[PDB]
Design a protein around this ligand. Structure first.
Ligand SMILES: NC(=O)c1ccc[n+]([C@@H]2O[C@H](COP(=O)([O-])OP(=O)(O)OC[C@H]3O[C@@H](n4cnc5c(N)ncnc54)[C@H](OP(=O)(O)O)[C@@H]3O)[C@@H](O)[C@H]2O)c1
Length: 761
């Protein structure tokens, strides 16, 4: 088919291969090269000589894992040599980085001999922090893995050996917990004994099971002690003394069936002879041992957990090894013992026993997952796997004593793992922590945020994420029966105690109408119009925030920006001199930039531009950053008629209002953001160090710039966030994702807290 040709093109387009080695530190200036190389490179080397433990602090040893192979068990191809298995190694390293943020040096060793292979790997100690054996044929894999573990003083893990056992072991706990099948009376049969099967039997035994109920099969029927030594000695370790010697006979009364063999190894005769709840594992990749559709045609009580991406409960190795190595490497452990492997088994099992956010669903075609029978293990592309399995593996290293580094703060450890998702995740987590610390000084009082669109799916999905973070107390607006129907349909268990208010049925509804009428009676609104407006949730939510029934509101997900801002501007107002304005955060690796005004004012005047700068400067001061404001123009300090004169005057007005801030203009965009340009060309400017607040002359420039930065610049931009309003209120867009709604609610909660304490003082 075209898939194989497309794969060849994927490995040949542009740069051949799939990996690239780049520098993580500045290496452009001569000073940069002198720091990275001689004579600056000698200083880190001296420290490692005195203290060998510093090799984990000055080099990339703490994040480097070697995927070493000899190419004798490359997938289903078999023994194709080490060079032919190179693309598999490169793909394995990609999975390591994409799911655990681990740098990988893939190694192919042209030595099929066990003794030669072990000596070559053993001398590679001072390079890598861990070794990942992969695609090594039996029985050579067992002997290589054992000696390497004893000799090498760094974690050694054969993914083909233990990786599948951990994922299947986690599924077994989830499968039995929904069938009342206590492991003490739990019969296990593994068909196709080999590299993975031996570890699977050992893993199950460590999971409260006994070898007496475990029987292993082979191509020559069912093996047992009566067989004349079978093959090798590894499979003889778990061999039982059961008289049965046929897969048909041995599967009678078998609680589970682990199909780690070739395709077409199941018959309906033993499919209807296992138990009241049989658990089967169709692990063969080229073709499943038993198709789930065929199994469903048989006894429906058969729990099926295959190993293919086209069916539920896929057993994927990518769930086990990235998080396990991340936990071992972060704790600087010296081994990957059974204690840590069991921790990953438990962590994966508990993770499936949890709610599935829309991020997992949207990744897999927008499906639904619950802890039932079609979802027994976390999905391979689930982001939370690293956030849950890795800390569990890290803890097991501490309790087993292998770990040589201490993780005292565990909340910081998860947010360090979460920080791998980008600067936007870091920025929002910092804002979430600020909300928590603001609430902690307020006595644990979370802000109340009302949503006029409780029927909206994106708002409801975002609220599922927001309640777990303890950011706010959400209030939904609408018919309680109509929104609870959608809450149940979308299956959020956390959104069950959430308060739902119908505007017309509220006890304070008629008091709200009188307040709206008194505010708008000489602005074209009569009593009949006020009653009709107050029935609209957007107007009702604005009056709850204005009166005090809520601290903030988030709307605009189902209407245009202009139609959603209007109730906020009419019910709530602006402050003494405030002006409504949209605000965007441009999140860079080192700093962040504030852009205003991006959504409201078409052509602000000099007085309005100065007010916009002051509002944006206060938002920057929320985070403890010193605001440095630049009025943007197409010219550099000219004051010519039009925009340059307006922006020059805007800076003068703003400096008068807040004389303790760095406000300057008019400049160009590159002059504002580059400190080197400012010092070289305009040393007279009062703005030093670069601007972090950017004020635009009109809406065309501000809107186009932040949308071009988001698209072309590939920088993280979050917003827009409404500013200049008397109370906390934010307006979404129809195109906002649930992640953008989460950021908007976090900003609304942050602004509500600041408005609350400012009003308190
Ligand atoms: N996705 C996963 O998590 C995962 C993990 C492991 C394996 N698998 C799949 O499961 C299969 C087996 O694993 P493997 O790669 O280790 O296999 P393998 O050893 O390469 O070959 C299967 C072995 O099982 C035995 N066997 C062959 N046909 C059999 C049959 N009809 N009934 C019973 N035993 C039979 C043979 O043992 P003798 O050599 O003693 O005759 C053979 O060596 C492969 O298809 C593999 O891709 C999937």
């Amino acid at each position: 088919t075209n898939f194989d040709q497309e794969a060849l093109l994927y490995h040949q387009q542009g740069k051949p291969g799939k990996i690239e080695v780049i520098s993580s530190k500045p290496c452009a200036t001569e000073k940069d090269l002198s720091l990275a190389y001689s004579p600056g490179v000698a200083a880190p080397c001296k420290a490692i000589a005195k203290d060998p433990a510093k090799v984990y602090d000055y080099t990339a040893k703490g994040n480097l894992v070697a995927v070493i192979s000899n190419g004798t068990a490359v997938l289903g191809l078999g023994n194709i040599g080490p060079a032919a298995g190179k693309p598999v190694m490169e793909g394995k390293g990609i999975l390591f980085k994409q799911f655990a943020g681990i740098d990988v040096f893939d190694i192919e060793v042209a030595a099929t001999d066990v003794d030669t292979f072990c000596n070559a790997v053993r001398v590679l100690e001072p390079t890598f922090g861990g070794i990942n054996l992969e695609d090594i044929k039996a029985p050579e894999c067992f002997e290589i893995e054992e000696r390497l573990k004893k000799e090498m003083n760094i974690p050694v893990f054969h993914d083909d050996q233990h990786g599948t056992a951990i994922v299947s072991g986690a599924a077994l706990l989830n499968a039995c917990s929904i069938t009342n099948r206590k492991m003490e009376d739990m019969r296990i049969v593994v068909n196709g004994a080999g590299a993975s099967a031996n570890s699977c039997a050992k893993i199950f035994i460590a999971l409260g099971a006994r070898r007496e109920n475990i029987i292993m099969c082979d191509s020559q029927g069912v093996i047992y002690k009566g067989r004349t030594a079978g093959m090798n000695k590894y499979k003889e370790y778990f061999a039982s003394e059961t008289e049965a010697r046929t897969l048909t006979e041995a599967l009678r009364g078998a609680d589970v069936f682990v199909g780690l063999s070739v395709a077409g190894a199941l018959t309906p005769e033993m499919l209807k002879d296992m138990a009241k709840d049989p658990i089967i594992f169709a692990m063969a990749n080229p073709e499943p041992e038993i198709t789930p559709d065929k199994a469903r045609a048989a006894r429906p009580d058969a729990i099926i957990a295959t190993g293919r991406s086209d069916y539920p409960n896929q057993v994927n190795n990518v769930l086990g090894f990235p998080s396990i190595f991340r936990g071992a490497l972060d704790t600087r452990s010296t081994q990957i013992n059974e204690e840590m492997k069991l921790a990953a088994v438990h962590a994966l099992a508990k993770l499936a026993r949890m709610d599935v956010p829309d991020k997992v669903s949207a990744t897999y075609g927008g499906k639904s997952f619950k802890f039932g029978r079609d979802y027994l293990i976390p999905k391979p592309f689930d982001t939370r796997v690293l956030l849950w399995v890795a800390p569990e593996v890290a803890k097991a290293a501490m309790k087993s004593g292998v770990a040589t580094r201490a993780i005292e703060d565990w909340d910081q450890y998860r947010e360090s793992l979460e920080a791998q998702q980008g600067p936007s995740k870091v920025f929002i987590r910092s804002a979430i922590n600020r909300v928590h610390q603001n609430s902690e000084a307020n006595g644990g009082e979370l802000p109340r945020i009302v949503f006029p669109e409780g029927t909206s799916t994106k708002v409801l999905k975002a609220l599922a994420t927001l309640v777990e973070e303890r950011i706010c107390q959400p209030i939904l607006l609408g018919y309680p029966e109509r929104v609870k129907e959608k809450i149940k349909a979308l299956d959020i268990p956390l959104l069950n105690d959430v308060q739902i208010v119908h505007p017309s049925s509220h006890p304070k509804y008629f008091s709200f109408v009188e307040k709206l009428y008194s505010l708008r009676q000489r602005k074209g609104i009569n009593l009949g119009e006020a009653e009709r407006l107050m029935a609209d949730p957007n107007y009702f939510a604005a009056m709850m925030v204005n009166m005090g029934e809520a601290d903030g509101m988030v709307s605009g997900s189902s209407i245009n920006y202009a139609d959603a801002v209007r109730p906020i501007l009419q019910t709530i107002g602006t402050y003494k001199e405030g002006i409504p304005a949209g605000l965007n955060f441009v999140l860079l690796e080192d700093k962040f930039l504030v852009l205003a005004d991006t959504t409201v004012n078409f052509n602000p005047s000099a007085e309005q531009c100065a007010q916009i700068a002051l509002q944006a400067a206060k938002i920057v001061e929320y985070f403890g950053i010193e605001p440095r404001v630049a009025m943007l123009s197409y010219s550099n300090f000219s004051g010519a008629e039009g925009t340059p004169r307006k922006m020059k005057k805007a800076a003068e007005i703003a400096r008068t209002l807040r004389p303790d801030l760095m406000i300057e203009g008019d400049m160009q965009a590159d002059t504002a953001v580059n400190p080197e340009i400012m010092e070289r060309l305009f040393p007279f400017s009062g703005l030093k160090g670069g601007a972090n607040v950017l004020v635009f002359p009109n809406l065309e420039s501000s809107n186009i710039a932040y949308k071009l930065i988001q698209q072309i610049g590939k920088a993280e931009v979050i917003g827009p966030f409404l500013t200049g309003v008397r109370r906390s209120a934010n307006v979404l867009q129809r195109t906002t994702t649930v992640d953008g709604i989460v950021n908007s609610v976090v900003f609304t909660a942050l602004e509500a807290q600041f408005i609350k304490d400012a009003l308190k003082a």
